[PDB]
Homo-oligomer: A and B are copies of this chain.
Amino acid sequence: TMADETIILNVLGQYTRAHDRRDPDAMAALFAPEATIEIVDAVGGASRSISRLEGRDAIRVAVRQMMAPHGYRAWSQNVVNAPIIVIEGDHAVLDAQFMVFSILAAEVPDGGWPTGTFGAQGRIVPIEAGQYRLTLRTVADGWVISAMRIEHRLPMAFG
């Protein structure tokens, strides 16, 4: 048995891993069956609804349909940071800042890197920023997400 705060932060870490893998099943497994994710536009401190995802199936579909799939040699990193945690009994609230970066790996030349090529080859770009607010509750073996709010600080377009 580890500290509740660590178990809760572990859930957040598993969330980012699933996010960057675009793994709907790993993502959904972190939530209570009936949990909702409210995604909102927080530019200028607004609270305009982008999408409300009700239940695990809705979450699974959104992992595919609401963010770009990774094309060849692409990845992402969801840099969650500055967590604030308040635990009161069997419920907790976690607020974290987040910033998502796109990662695009250069193709490795068949003839090798030319003389004078050093360091990472590719592009890393910050592509989203905002805050997560998670409500968690206990389960027998740890903690699960019972509700989540995603606040975006850039406008989000869907094609």
A positions within 8 Å CB-CB of B: 2-3, 5-6, 9-10, 12-14, 16-17, 43-44, 68, 72-73, 75, 77-87, 95, 97, 99, 101, 103, 105-106, 108, 113, 115-122, 124-129, 152-159
Contacts and interface: CB of A to CB of B under 8 A. Distances in A.
B101 A99 contact: yes
A154 B120 contact: yes
Given A2-B85, A12-B82, A78-B82, A154 B124 contact: yes
Given A10-B85, A43-B73, A79-B79, A127 B117 contact: no
Given A5-B6, A82-B13, A82-B16, A126 B155 contact: no
A159 B108 CA distance: 14
A23 to B, nearest CB: 11
Contacts of A17: 82, 84
A103 B82 CA distance: 17
Nearest to A79: B81
A97 B77 contact: yes
Nearest to A44: B73
A49 to B, nearest CB: 14
A142 to B, nearest CB: 11
Contacts of A106: 154-155
B2 A115 contact: no
A103 B153 CA distance: 8
A127 B120 contact: yes
